[PDB]
Enzyme design. Sequence first.
Site, PDB file in Angstrom:
ATOM      1  N   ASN A 243       0.816  -1.218   0.000  1.00  0.00           N
ATOM      2  CA  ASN A 243       0.000   0.000   0.000  1.00  0.00           C
ATOM      3  C   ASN A 243       0.854   1.274   0.000  1.00  0.00           C
ATOM      4  OD1 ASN A 243      -2.498  -1.601   2.111  1.00  0.00           O
ATOM      5  ND2 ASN A 243      -2.515  -1.312  -0.115  1.00  0.00           N
TER       6      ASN A 243
ATOM      7  N   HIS B  49      -1.512  -6.875   6.599  1.00  0.00           N
ATOM      8  CA  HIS B  49      -2.806  -6.977   7.246  1.00  0.00           C
ATOM      9  C   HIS B  49      -2.603  -7.435   8.687  1.00  0.00           C
ATOM     10  CE1 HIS B  49      -5.684  -7.261   3.557  1.00  0.00           C
ATOM     11  NE2 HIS B  49      -4.932  -6.175   3.550  1.00  0.00           N
TER      12      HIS B  49
ATOM     13  N   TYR C 266       0.661  -9.092  -1.513  1.00  0.00           N
ATOM     14  CA  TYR C 266       1.033  -7.708  -1.219  1.00  0.00           C
ATOM     15  C   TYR C 266       2.523  -7.478  -1.477  1.00  0.00           C
ATOM     16  CZ  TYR C 266      -3.625  -6.647   0.400  1.00  0.00           C
ATOM     17  OH  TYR C 266      -4.993  -6.424   0.396  1.00  0.00           O
TER      18      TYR C 266
ATOM     19  N   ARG D  51      -5.772 -14.413   0.307  1.00  0.00           N
ATOM     20  CA  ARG D  51      -7.085 -14.529  -0.321  1.00  0.00           C
ATOM     21  C   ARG D  51      -7.097 -14.517  -1.840  1.00  0.00           C
ATOM     22  NH1 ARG D  51      -7.369  -8.489   0.879  1.00  0.00           N
ATOM     23  NH2 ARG D  51      -8.479  -7.550  -0.887  1.00  0.00           N
TER      24      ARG D  51
END
Length: 721
Positions: A180, A230, A239, A293
């Site tokens: 991110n 996370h 990620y 996921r």
Amino acid sequence: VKDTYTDRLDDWNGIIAGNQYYDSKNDQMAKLNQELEGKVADSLSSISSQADRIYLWEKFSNYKTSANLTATYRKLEEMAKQVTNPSSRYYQDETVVRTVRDSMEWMHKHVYNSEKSIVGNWWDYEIGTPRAINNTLSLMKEYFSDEEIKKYTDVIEKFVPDPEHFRKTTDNPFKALGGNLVDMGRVKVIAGLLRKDDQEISSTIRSIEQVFKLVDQGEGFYQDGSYIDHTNVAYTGAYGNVLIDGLSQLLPVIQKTKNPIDKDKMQTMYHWIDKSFAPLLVNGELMDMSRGRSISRANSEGHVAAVEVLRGIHRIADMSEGETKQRLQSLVKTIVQSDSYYDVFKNLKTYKDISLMQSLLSDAGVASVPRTSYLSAFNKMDKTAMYNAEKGFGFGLSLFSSRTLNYEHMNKENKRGWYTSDGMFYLYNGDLSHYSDGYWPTVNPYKMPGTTETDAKRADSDTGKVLPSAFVGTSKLDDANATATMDFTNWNQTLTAHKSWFMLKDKIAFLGSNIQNTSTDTAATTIDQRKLESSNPYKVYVNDKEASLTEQEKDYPETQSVFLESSDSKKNIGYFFFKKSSISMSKALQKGAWKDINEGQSDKEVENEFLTISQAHKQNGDSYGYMLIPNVDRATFNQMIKELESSLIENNETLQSVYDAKQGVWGIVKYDDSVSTISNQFQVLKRGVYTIRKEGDEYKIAYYNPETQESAPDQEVFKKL
Ligand SMILES: O=C1O[C@H]([C@H](O)CO)C(O)=C1O
């Protein structure tokens, strides 16, 4: 208006589109161009062209669903790419130029502007959409006025004013780190180049640096190669991808600004590649146990996900020089060439990336030698990766503990990943498509391979949990041998088991003891659930006698061994049970849909055949013990079990141990601090995980205490007899 910012934006354009590298006589490039042209045509023939429309595209009309926002802008970006491509049928086309400009206004006036607030996922208001808007104004900068660019990027400023935090507009913002944090650079360094805001550029760059540090806690890369996101989820393969993929895109531009980044800080980038990513890549596949996921996304199966990492590495190699550039190039070349199942070009989406890959693969000067053997114990994310170059197989151990979440079910994705970390194992062999071709939506979620569980029904609405115990971890002796354990307790505390694994070069022993069940549900361990190939069928041997499996569960008591025989030895799998056990087997067609595990996926039915082997535990204090032997032919297998007929040292509630006489290696797991004498040679003294090798009269020791996450002086844990 044609200054130094446009210079940097030009570089960006060459990176995100690369129209200047296009060559129509280039097979692969022409292919990608064919794809973009078709996308733009479909968007143009379905866009709303009536008075005061209520949606630009109907498939993305519900502007209450966050996705429809960036999927709509993504379409204008594809148009910006073709309109600036001299070889496109849409090059400088007046309808395309006007459509984009006209469409920027509409979305701006009625759907995404400053006076708006996040509705749906924040990701789209702060990352997805702002990124697609930036790219569009960059690519088509010669068609927009500075004031128009300013006006169109102002909204990005509103939702993302802070290059350090996300969701700043909401009530619960959060600190930007990792993937991110890199996406933050793609949003504010470009928007700042577009807005010609030196302040915005330097501050976002300054903020990006954070990514170049290693962490001993929280999210980010650990010195042992683990990568967490996370809060507490193993996430290198998802990620981590975003991080490298995005950073490799930005760096070239960043480095040509008045705020470049220190050549040493990028030294750590090579560490991530070698310690974090490389080990998760087997025959071109990115191990699913690290993708969270994303495993429930149909268009992002293992081999496809692997390409996000490879193109990032490739881009980084191109930035480096000398040896480093050479070694990264060979790393990409050998991996790409070892992949006989997926065509890497299927996921190289810019002309620069295609050109780069082609140069790489056709350059004889760049070495392409098979990767050597290796074993990585990512203890900081409770995952373990093993690879044998001689026999050619990979093995993955998926666990979790009090320090990590078992599975991530979020945004309606991965609805049935309940047991993917309950001691689940992965076997990567000759069948490179095993975990692909719809494996995820068709595999029985209740019988993940290697896991011990009750047959209680589970809810799709459930979410991840941490393990009550911290006694989960791997003790690595070398790159071919290691021992792991998991003080297991199931989701509702009705079942427990001491599960241990002994990785011994070309085989892995699975020991389970102290199995207890307080519920009324039935308990059993899935020895395996292998996805079959209609092309390479298996001949099943139980106790070396040909067996015919049915959809109906057949029971085989007094089973000493099971062998799956393929015409390709690199696909064979044997299971030797240290003690005759009662197992049951079945072969059956299993159907499912991707929507079943990911709401946003397709409802289309998928199906695959699976061979399921399992052992029931109808008593408290039960156990299991078998050796998995892959890639050997039947005759060798039969030979090996004769040697391993005495490899089980022990398997009870306080101690589990397997001995490899050929190697002189011991795998040992102690649950208590009593003194254990092993093979009348030495004694182990502490709770924890061991892997010992006798070399002459000397002993090599690898001790690991999973609870404290520490090794220890030899004399505290080992005493030679
Ligand atoms: O991080 C994320 O990735 C996906 C995305 O759909 C890919 O664009 C999404 O749902 C997120 O919140």
